[PDB]
């Protein structure tokens, strides 16, 4: 019966979870970790990624 309100809960939560899981994407970079990129590359090369 409360599927209406719950679906709202499960849609907000799902959107947030996708947003969080999009932090683990390279998007073409060498890594998805800014700290790894920064610790591995000098700034002129790092900025590109």
């Amino acid at each position: 019966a409360l599927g209406k309100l719950q679906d709202v809960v499960n849609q907000n939560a799902q959107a947030l979870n996708t947003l969080v899981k999009q932090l683990s994407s390279n998007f073409g970079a060498i890594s998805s970790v800014l700290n790894d990129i920064l610790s591995r590359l000098d700034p002129p090369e790092a900025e590109v990624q």
């Binding site: 060498i30 610790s39 591995r40 590359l41 090369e45």
Partner: protein
């Protein structure tokens, strides 16, 4: 070149900057990591294909 020697390097401390300032290396192209940062990193294995 057709029979290039591969040496696996592990369980040691590598002074990459030392090697860097050792001779006249006409090419030091480091892809994916900058040479000056090589001292701040730990690698699982180093393969030296010569």
């Amino acid at each position: 070149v057709y029979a290039w020697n591969r040496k696996r390097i592990s369980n040691c401390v590598a002074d990459y900057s030392v090697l860097y300032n050792s001779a006249s290396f006409s090419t030091f192209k480091c892809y994916g990591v900058s040479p000056t940062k090589l001292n701040d990193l730990c690698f699982t294995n180093v393969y030296a294909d010569s």
